[PDB]
Design a protein around this nucleic acid. Sequence first.
DNA 1: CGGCAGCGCAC
DNA 2: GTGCGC
DNA 3: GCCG
Length: 327
Amino acid sequence: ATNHNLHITEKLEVLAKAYSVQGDKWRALGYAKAINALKSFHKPVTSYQEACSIPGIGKRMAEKIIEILESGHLRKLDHISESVPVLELFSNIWGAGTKTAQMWYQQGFRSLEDIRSQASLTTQQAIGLKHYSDFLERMPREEATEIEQTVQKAAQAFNSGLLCVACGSYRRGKATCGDVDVLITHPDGRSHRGIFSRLLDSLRQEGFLTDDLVSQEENGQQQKYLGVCRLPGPGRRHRRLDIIVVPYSEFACALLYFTGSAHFNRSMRALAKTKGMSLSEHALSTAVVRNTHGCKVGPGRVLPTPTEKDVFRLLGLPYREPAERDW
DNA sequence: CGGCAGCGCAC
DNA sequence: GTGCGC
DNA sequence: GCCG
Ligand SMILES: C[As](C)(=O)[O-]
Ligand SMILES: [Mg+2]
Ligand code: NA
């Protein structure tokens, strides 16, 4: 689906990014939705009225869209803080968001070297810093595959019936991936237990895992590892690797959630809500019970979903292949 | 206007 | 509790 | 930022 409003979506992507790095995440969200629409519009935008007919574009966005169309420029871009470029540089560090970026900028830091030399860093940020270049580049789809295989082989050594699948952008079919998320479960419903720990162990012993960002995260019955790996071989880069072990009963929803994209998940939650349901990485459930004051005082009932299709079906939706989940 | 999900971790 | 990424 |  070619974009017929490039010079517009280009200038808008700059302003969006600017708001994002300065902390205005919600406004950044709005821009990103509007920018998507502009790209997937069935043709070029020629009027303010036309612009306003596209869901996701309101008066203010139309206003900007038309300014670029007619004038070829966007004044707003000229008044963007000079700090932006640096705030982005600092936030490209895994573990450092806008607040940390702003703090470092206020302390007079300007380069990655200043950070490395005078900045106070958290354990995660330090790891993020030494792997700045590596974590910045998207890896070839092929390397993501090898990483998944490495995890799978080591997991199946403990139990051959385990099911492993790489999610994220990789499962959505992208040529390159910024990271790998390996979701692991077992069809029998309980043999996935007591796998997480010895698996990370096995992978560390063989030198595959080089750094831990979060060694273990317990979310209900889901165990998640956020770390860094590097395949054997000279010239291999370090890569962001996540490992998630979940009970089979939550495999579908976990698969759906970690395959994303983040915009897709967002739309699915919104839709669940309209049907009186909630969708999480754990399950599709009826909405929670709330008292007169309108406050969660009783979880909803989980609606069993063996496969992703079951989730789409219960939401009265046509199944969407992973490759079609960018938005 | 409030919602745009809500979680667990490191600090 | 806040900041961050999932 | 947009939406209801
Ligand atoms: C101000 As309005 C069109 O978002 O209700
Ligand atoms: Mg507001
Ligand atoms: Na960051």
